[PDB]
Ligand binder design. Structure first.
Ligand SMILES: CC(C)c1cc(-c2ccc3c(c2)[C@H](N)CO3)cc([C@H](O)Cn2ccc3cccc(C(=O)O)c32)c1
Length: 236
């Protein structure tokens, strides 16, 4: 996260850190708890991942330094990548992880609702992107979970910023005209969470953009509302 601030314990309890364990253990991507055995994340995170055997999902983490050899985690039983996915920038950047066991919900780990049926035209004004990603192009994964409030940009405006790409209704964009706050490498797969009527909804999945926090280059997110039927079919 560029231009963010440190989160506190229990602030984003649906946020998880997805680690790989090979050839070293490191944070790969963010994700969001959406059910008792389900993480919603980005398909592009699984580049070069041979099978679910090397993954670990950690919930209830504030600081990456908290993760030691005795820290509890969930194994990943299955990786479900959207059948149309090929690359983040070409869309369908969505995946589900089915966990090996159920998440017991507490103040530090609980699900986030999907955008609700009937809310297709809601105007979200309180949206936040979170993660342990880079704060600049040549950085590293950050210790403390960062947050930044980012305004949504219309698809028509987003397309004008990305004339070389197809910005579709299956994408949603968020950024400041003058940049300064954005998601970046390692935030991918995590949530764009919007609070409406005092309830958080998972509106986007961090996916891609041109650089990080550049002026007139908003972040591009998977538009979760356009995949609710796909998610429900996979998690039913
Ligand atoms: C410019 C540069 C530093 C860079 C930037 C981004 C990036 C991420 C989010 C974001 C933006 C940019 C926009 N500012 C809005 O939100 C991503 C990357 C990643 O190499 C991509 N990647 C490709 C394969 C792979 C496998 C796992 C995780 C990631 C991963 O995305 O972390 C993988 C790089």
């Amino acid at each position: 996260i560029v231009g963010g601030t440190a989160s506190v314990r229990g602030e984003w309890p649906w946020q998880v850190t997805l680690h790989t364990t090979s050839p070293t253990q490191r944070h790969l991507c963010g994700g969001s708890i959406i059910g008792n055995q389900w993480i919603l994340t980005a398909a592009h995170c699984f580049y070069g991942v041979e099978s679910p055997k090397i993954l670990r999902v950690y919930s209830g983490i504030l600081n990456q330094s908290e993760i030691k050899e005795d820290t509890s985690f969930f194994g990943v039983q299955e990786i479900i990548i959207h059948d149309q996915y090929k690359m983040a920038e070409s869309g369908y950047d969505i995946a589900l992880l089915k966990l090996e066991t159920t998440v017991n919900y507490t103040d530090s780990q609980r699900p986030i609702s999907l955008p609700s049926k009937g809310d297709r035209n809601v105007i979200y004004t309180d949206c936040w992107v979170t993660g342990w990603g880079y704060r600049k192009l040549r950085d590293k994964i950050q210790n403390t979970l960062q947050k930044a409030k980012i305004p949504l940009v219309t698809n028509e405006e987003c397309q004008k910023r990305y004339r070389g790409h197809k910005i579709t209704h299956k994408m949603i964009c968020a950024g400041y005209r003058e940049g300064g706050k954005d998601a970046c490498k390692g935030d991918s797969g995590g949530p764009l969470s919007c609070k409406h009527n005092e309830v958080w909804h998972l509106v986007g999945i961090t996916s891609w953009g041109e650089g990080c926090a550049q002026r007139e280059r908003p972040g591009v997110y998977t538009n979760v509302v356009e995949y609710v039927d796909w998610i429900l079919e996979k998690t039913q």
